[PDB]
Design a protein around this ligand. Structure first.
Ligand SMILES: Nc1ncnc2c1ncn2[C@@H]1O[C@H](COP(=O)(O)OP(=O)(O)O)[C@@H](O)[C@H]1O
Ligand SMILES: [Mg+2]
Lengths: 1476, 16
RNA sequence: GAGACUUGGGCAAUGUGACUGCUGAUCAGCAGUCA
RNA sequence: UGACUGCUGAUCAGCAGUCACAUUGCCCAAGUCUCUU
């Protein structure tokens, strides 16, 4: 909408002048200068569309206040087609980065915002001065001296002088202040600072008359008599306020910050103590100036503000102060209103009576104002009034607003016409006259005035510029005009015709106001004459005088890369950086200044320094600038402060705190440099540590390709080659009883079976195995018997025997299984054996050559049974049979024969009255007919168990059915007999449960050898060739089916002779994930691995960086031990495919060793993973390959392959189209999916198992193997031993017995701590809170707590691992987390009375600790273990954490650290070790 | 004085 | 985590007013010395 | 009458300090609501 906004002639001339060269427009307010600025912005639209990098420029528009900025943003948005930006500090631009900055600059062709924000964003090289077309400023008269407008204008000279953007200022009044004398110098200053001449209309006939539709007002002055005498109530109230102030200083409170005057010469009062003085001093002024009724009104506002403060008082002392203030205020209000009510009865017109008494009880100024109000508006329509009221004090606005409300309600006529309202500056006053938050307001007072909802508008000096208000026809001023600019602005508010401009003055000061108003008028006339009659000078681009106006300041320092730091912005930059220091609530975020006397000036600096001042800066102790920065000798104290802050900021940037763009850095920027230092390996996976999006897939799992151990890969025996066979022994480990002989005797038979490999096998550990009837331990022969296959047919027959074993004798077979002929992974063999000559054991050759295929139990009728040869007992003794006539499934071991029992004999039980023969005929004789032999021998038999995974340890006696099962007796000639040796079957029923465990014990041993060799301890006699493996351990801690005792790990740390060989079983324990559900789990080592990893990372970071603050070190440390990082650093090591995670059920979840899928099928599976992932178990089970291809040929038929491919392609669109099948078919193809959590857990488990045996020092080498703590190649030994012997620096080279002053009576600390410090620097550094300015010889506690946390955590975890051997790891982690809790640390700290010796100055936390310690004493130092106190103070646990590290670093003896930790944790540890 | 002096019921809005 | 508004704290910036300290100029008088 | 000192007042300029008032801005952080993990 611009057609109705058509410009005027003077606007055109002004735009034309400002386009050619820079200048400052000067017209009376309401002339549309902002519209001129809009047109100027439009005149630069030639390059607003092009991007910055291609030469496109963006318009810049800046204003002094946020409200004017918002109004102009709306105006330009409605009056231009450009996308209008908004760049202010009230919208949260504090934490922006280059991304949204760049995209906002790209998208917004014009930018609007405040001055400081634009200064900051142009100094920090977001946009260069060469990147802009035109910059428009408004209210330039504020921009003088050190105002941000002048600072922004300074940057034009410091940058590229050519291709410099146009700049123009907007103003209606050009000079601010009473120094208007000799207007010429200020005119030159403003025309040179903005490098532009000032222009104004110059012909009253055509320009001034036209623009004077913004008509000047009519001056009116009303005089009132002086106050002849003061009242009794005022002086009585002042006398009360006297003793009130006296008691305010008498009132003692806690320590408060120190405030001094602006020149650092006078001692001020704390702000919270001076606010009440300021409030009462304003109230007294209100009383003495505007009348007693005004004071009655304002005491209500005092009540309101004091009630708000009392509600919001953080400390009880502040609450007491504000309560005393409220009591005094209420007493004052009652005493004051007593006088009002003693005379508010002079006449019977009630509300008009109130009006008359207000008239009576009003000062002559306010009385005259009320008469003017009554006689001015003539009781016209309420919409006929547009008036403004200006008073100096903010509270005077609300006071006279309440007075106007009451008086108008008291008026008969003005009641219906007038409605008041008050506003103040941005430091808004509580608009309510009652308790806080009467209502949720939603309409601003300016909006009320614009909408016509109000006609009177009480205001302070906030309503002269910026706010767009309709032209008022009345203006009233209650206080004398102070400044020329305020006069010009206030008289400019009355813009409509016949407007009334009224100002009130006293009688005997009337003439002074007369002279000052004529001087203001004469000054305006002189300005007009100077502009009109000046010589026809150019724009005045005189660089000599421009430079001569600026050099007085310190030279603006610009660093490399084009960034610049303004010395006038130095204070703001330094304070902004200093606030970023981590604190509790305050933490001394302000730099403590101090000016030096002349003696120090001529002691330190040059001879010239007697007159010029020198100031010293003391940075907060939580900053590495422990020393002081000295100011340059400067003319006055203010410039000396500027120089000191500027030099300190330059030093801080030299130490890297300020970034490339002079903004203080945070964790996001701190980790950017460290990214490629410790997290380089993430790049091979594509992502990075700083990439937060990399954590989006933290919870998902990952797939891996498993592989057999090297001992199994290509271990198939070959014909005519050396091959080793290992004999397997299954020793029973229980007392034999009648319910156990059937397996006890058979398992101990000298006959057995051997596992045969071409390769050699290392010595393996003893396995626990749990049968349902006893406990089994299985061993493998150390010396493998060696034979060479002389006949390929013998090897073939062995191979079909091995296949037949799993196919039939255990039924561990699927129709898609194919005998794995090829020599590859898991291609070993199982061979039965029999006794040979002497102790030598040889092949049971008849056994394999007889049982090529399992005999079939043919159902034989009596017609057929009568012609087979008769049964003969030794042919059945020790054999396996099957009760086919009852159930054609069960195997049945023949333990003995009853030659004394016959079918004619009476049954032993359950049919004792009757016999076997007719019993069989009753139920099974119907289908089988008669039986051949009526009077022959019987056989007593026992059945084999059907269990298949003998890991669980539950045990019991099945007396309900075992007695009936053990007595099962069958007819010999009825049940089919396989004549197979029952001992061999009874041994091989356990075979897969042994093969699976060996398949991982090999991995454990092969990894242990590698780890030992890398540590270069494999030559030690306990390791290497002479290693004797130990039997595994049962985990009974699990439930799933005087002097402190020296800590073993630390004891073996110092003494290398206490080391012990690493067990294969201990590695296997860390290999088996808890999902596999074995007898032992890896979670017991995982917690110690985590503790040691955190400790080592913390120490490595502390040694690497002793300067950075504890926050960035803590977050980096938490990033290092992050589970995703452990995943990424363990994938490379090829550990995950070595792990043990899944359940072992051979029928459904395990693959036989010597049997695999067809080779072509596997090739197809691994060629197309997308085609492979859509194949389920049923698709494989569809075919049933014949004996030839499956067994001898070792492949599948071509037509069978066709059926596979056709079925898979059909299932690609079948009911299972798109479904996932990898969750169950991966076990047949050597693939597995493992959680990343398990990967991190097993990394930590390996670290823990290494630590608990090899000591702390050796494990640091292993961290090098995992490339976590990258070795400093210059000094590698610092990663080996100095990691626990480092951490300090030259800070200890300065010392004095003055430290005893800070450590008041530390002998009691030694007595209640036990430790005796060799150096007191550590204890002092631990005891200093960052909110402590008194001390500078030492540092804060943060960079000690960083190490103390890790040390305490590691020692606690080690102790709970060692001593607590009968409790679950899942609760062990909870116990550890409870022992490291901050509340427990605070309780320990306060029990020994360590709160007294803390060094800190912060009232709120001091009161927090005070309210904590008394409660804890009320608990008798026995915290229920947590006590529901008010709030735990973090500092009490923090100082204990720091003291732990200080005690350790004093002597470097971890044993001493454990001693003191146990001494301070004894009762809590004893309580927690009993119950978590 | 114990009271405010009642200003004149009339006064002039003089022109400067 | 973000957007709106309010609460709370700290620093910087412009200007006026009051009192003090010091320098320079101008005007004036007195007292004292020389010419 | 001049030179000059002593005393003291007045005017004016400039600088610096104390106290108070007014307006403007940035930063940290809290509350609730909504978007929403
Ligand atoms: N030439 C013009 N054409 C259309 N409208 C104008 C013109 N000049 C002034 N105005 C209107 O008068 C108003 C003047 O307000 P403002 O711009 O704040 O005045 P100033 O900037 O002089 O204080 C604007 O809102 C504008 O819409
Ligand atoms: Mg305006």
């Amino acid at each position: 909408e611009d057609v109705e906004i058509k410009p005027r002639g003077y606007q055109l001339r002004l735009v034309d002048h400002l386009t050619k060269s820079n200048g400052i427009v000067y017209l009376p307010t309401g002339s549309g200068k902002t519209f001129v600025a809009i047109l100027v912005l439009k005149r630069f639209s030639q390059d607003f569309d092009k991007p910055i990098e291609s030469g496109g420029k963006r318009a810049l528009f800046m204003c002094n206040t946020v409200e004017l900025a918002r109004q102009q943003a709306m105006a330009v948005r409605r009056c231009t087609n450009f996308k209008v930006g908004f760049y202010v500090g009230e919208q949260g631009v504090d934490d922006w980065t280059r991304g949204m900055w760049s995209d906002e600059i790209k998208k917004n062709q014009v930018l609007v915002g405040t001055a400081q924000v634009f200064l900051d964003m142009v100094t920090q090289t977001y946009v260069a001065l060469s990147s802009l077309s035109v910059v428009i400023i408004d209210e330039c008269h504020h921009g003088t001296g050190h105002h941000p407008f002048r600072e922004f204008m300074r940057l034009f000279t410091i940058a590229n002088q050519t291709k410099l953007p146009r700049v123009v200022g907007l103003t209606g009044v050009l000079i601010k202040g009473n120094e208007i004398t000799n207007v010429a110098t200020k005119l030159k200053e403003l025309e040179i600072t903005y490098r532009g001449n000032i222009i104004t209309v110059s012909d009253t006939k055509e320009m001034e008359n036209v623009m004077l539709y913004a008509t000047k007002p009519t001056e009116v002055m009303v005089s009132f008599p002086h106050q002849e005498q003061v009242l009794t109530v005022t002086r009585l109230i002042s006398a009360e306020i006297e003793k009130f102030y006296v008691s305010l200083d008498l009132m003692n409170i806690g320590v408060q910050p120190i405030r001094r005057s602006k020149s650092l010469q006078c001692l001020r009062d704390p702000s919270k103590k001076s606010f009440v003085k300021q409030l009462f001093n304003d109230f007294l002024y209100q009383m003495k100036e505007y009348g007693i009724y005004a004071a009655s009104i304002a005491i209500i506002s005092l009540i309101v503000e004091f009630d708000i403060k009392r509600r919001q008082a953080e400390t009880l002392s502040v609450k007491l102060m504000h309560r005393t203030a409220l009591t005094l205020c209420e007493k004052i209000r009652h005493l004051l209103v007593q006088k009002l009510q003693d005379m508010t009865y002079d006449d019977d017109d009630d509300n008009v009576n109130t009006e008359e008494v207000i008239m009576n009880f009003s000062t002559p100024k306010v009385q005259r104002f009320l008469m003017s109000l009554k006689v001015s508006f003539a009781d016209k329509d309420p919409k006929d009034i547009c008036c403004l009221v200006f008073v100096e004090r903010r509270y005077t606005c609300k006071c006279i607003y309440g007075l106007l409300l009451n008086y108008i309600q008291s008026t008969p006529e003005l009641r219906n016409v007038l409605t008041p309202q008050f506003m103040v500056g941005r430091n808004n006053i509580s608009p309510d006259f009652e308790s806080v938050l009467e209502r949720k307001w939603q309409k601003s007072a300016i909006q009320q005035f614009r909408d016509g909802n109000a006609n009177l508008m009480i205001c302070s000096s906030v309503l002269e510029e910026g706010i767009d208000v309709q032209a008022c026809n009345h203006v009233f001023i209650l206080d004398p005009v102070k400044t020329f600019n305020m006069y010009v602005q206030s008289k400019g508010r009355a813009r409509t015709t016949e407007a009334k401009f009224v100002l009130f003055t006293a009688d005997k000061e009337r003439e002074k106001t007369i002279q000052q108003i004529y001087q203001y008028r004469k000054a305006h006339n002189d300005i007009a004459e100077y502009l009109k009659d000046r010589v026809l000078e150019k724009t005045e681009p005189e660089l000599y005088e421009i430079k001569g106006h600026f050099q007085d300041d310190i030279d603006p320092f610009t660093n490399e890369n084009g960034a610049v730091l303004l010395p006038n912005n130095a204070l703001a930059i330094l304070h902004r950086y200093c606030q970023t220091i981590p604190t509790d609530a305050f933490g001394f975020v302000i730099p403590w200044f101090h000016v030096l006397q002349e003696d120090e000036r001529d002691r330190i600096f040059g001879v010239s320094a007697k007159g010029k001042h020198v100031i010293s800066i003391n940075m907060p102790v939580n900053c590495m600038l422990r020393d002081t920065i000295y100011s340059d000798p400067m003319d006055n104290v203010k410039t000396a402060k500027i120089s000191a802050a500027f030099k300190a900021c330059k030093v801080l940037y030299s130490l890297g705190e300020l970034n490339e763009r002079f903004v203080p850095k945070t964790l996001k920027e701190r980790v950017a440099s460290i990214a490629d230092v410790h997290f380089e390996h993430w790049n091979k996976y594509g992502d990075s540590v700083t990439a937060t999006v990399n954590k989006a897939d933290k919870s998902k799992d990952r797939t891996y390709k498993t592989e057999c151990p090297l001992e199994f890969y290509d271990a198939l025996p070959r014909v005519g080659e050396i091959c080793y066979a290992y004999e397997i022994f299954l020793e029973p480990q229980f007392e034999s009883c009648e319910y156990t002989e059937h397996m006890y005797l058979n398992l101990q038979t000298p006959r057995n079976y051997a596992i045969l490999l071409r390769n050699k096998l290392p010595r393996l550990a003893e396995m626990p195995l749990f049968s349902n009837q006893g406990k089994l331990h299985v061993r493998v022969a150390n010396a493998p018997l060696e034979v060479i296959i002389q006949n390929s047919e013998q090897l073939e027959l062995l191979h079909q025997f091995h296949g037949m074993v799993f196919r039939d004798i255990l039924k561990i077979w699927h129709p898609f299984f194919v005998l794995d002929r090829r020599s590859k992974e898991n291609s070993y063999l199982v061979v039965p054996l029999i006794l040979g000559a002497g102790e030598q054991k040889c092949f049971d050759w008849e056994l394999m050559t007889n049982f090529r295929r399992l005999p079939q139990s043919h159902g034989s009728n009596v017609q057929q049974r009568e012609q087979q040869p008769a049964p003969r007992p030794e042919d059945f003794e020790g054999k396996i049979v099957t009760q086919w006539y009852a159930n054609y499934d069960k195997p049945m071991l023949v333990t003995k024969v009853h030659r004394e029992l016959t079918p004619l004999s009476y049954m032993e039980k359950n049919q004792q009255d009757k016999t076997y023969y007719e019993f069989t005929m009753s139920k099974y004789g119907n289908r089988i007919g008669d039986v051949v032999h009526k009077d022959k021998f019987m056989i007593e038999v026992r059945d084999l168990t059907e269990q298949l995974t003998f890991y669980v340890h539950n045990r019991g006696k099945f007396n309900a059915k075992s007695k009936a099962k053990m007595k099962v007796i069958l007819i010999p000639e009825l049940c089919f007999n396989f004549n197979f040796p029952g001992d061999l079957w009874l041994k091989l029923i356990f075979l897969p449960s042994i093969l699976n465990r060996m398949y991982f014990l090999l991995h454990a041993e092969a990894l242990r050898k590698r780890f030992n060799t890398y540590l270069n301890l494999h030559l030690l006699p306990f390791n290497g060739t002479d290693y004797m493996p130990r039997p595994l351990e049962i985990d009974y801690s699990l439930k799933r089916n005087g002097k402190v005792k020296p800590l073993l790990i630390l004891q073996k740390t110092v003494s290398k002779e206490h080391i012990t060989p690493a067990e294969q079983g201990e590695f296997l324990a860390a290999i088996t994930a808890s999902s596999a559900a074995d007898v032992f789990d890896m979670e017991r080592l995982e917690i110690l691995g985590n503790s040691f990893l955190k400790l080592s990372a913390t120490l490595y970071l502390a040694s690497k960086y002793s300067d950075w603050n504890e926050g960035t070190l803590t977050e980096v440390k938490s990033k290092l031990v992050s589970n995703r990082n452990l995943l990424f650093c363990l994938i490379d090591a090829d550990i995950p495919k070595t792990l043990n995670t899944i359940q072992f059920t051979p029928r459904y979840t395990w693959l036989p060793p010597g049997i695999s899928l067809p080779h072509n099928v596997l090739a197809l599976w691994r060629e197309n993973p997308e085609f492979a992932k859509i194949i389920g178990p049923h698709n494989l089970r569809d075919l049933a390959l014949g004996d030839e291809e499956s067994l001898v040929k070792g492949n599948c038929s071509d037509i069978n392959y066709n059926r596979f491919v056709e079925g898979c392609r059909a299932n690609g669109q079948s009911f299972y189209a798109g479904a996932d099948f990898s969750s169950e078919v991966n076990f047949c193809v050597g693939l597995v999916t493992i959680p990343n959590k398990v990967i991190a857990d097993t990394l930590e488990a390996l670290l823990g198992v290494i630590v608990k045996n090899y000591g702390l020092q050796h494990a640091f080498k292993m961290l090098e193997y995992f490339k976590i703590c990258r070795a400093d190649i210059d000094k590698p030994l610092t990663q080996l031993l100095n990691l626990e012997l480092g951490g300090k620096k030259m800070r200890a080279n300065v010392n004095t017995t003055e430290i005893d002053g800070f450590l008041i009576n530390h002998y009691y600390l030694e007595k209640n701590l036990g430790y005796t410090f060799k150096d007191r620097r550590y204890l002092l550094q631990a005891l200093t809170h960052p909110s402590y300015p008194t001390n500078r010889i030492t540092g804060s506690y943060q960079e000690l707590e960083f190490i103390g946390n890790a040390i305490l955590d590691f020692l606690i975890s080690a102790y709970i691992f060692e001593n607590n051997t009968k409790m679950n790891p899942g609760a062990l982690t909870d116990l550890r987390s409870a022992l490291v809790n901050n509340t427990t640390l605070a309780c320990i700290c306060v029990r020994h009375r360590l709160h007294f010796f803390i060094l800190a100055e912060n009232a709120k936390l001091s009161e927090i600790i005070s309210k904590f310690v008394n409660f804890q004493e009320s608990q008798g130092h026995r915290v229920t273990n947590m006590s529901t106190n008010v709030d735990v103070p973090k500092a009490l646990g923090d100082v204990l954490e720091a003291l732990i590290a200080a005690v350790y670093l004093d002597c470097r003896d971890l044993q001493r650290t454990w001693e003191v930790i146990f001494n301070l944790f004894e009762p809590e540890l004893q309580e927690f070790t009993r119950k978590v | 004085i114990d009271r405010y002096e009642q200003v004149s019921k009339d006064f002039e809005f003089i022109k400067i």
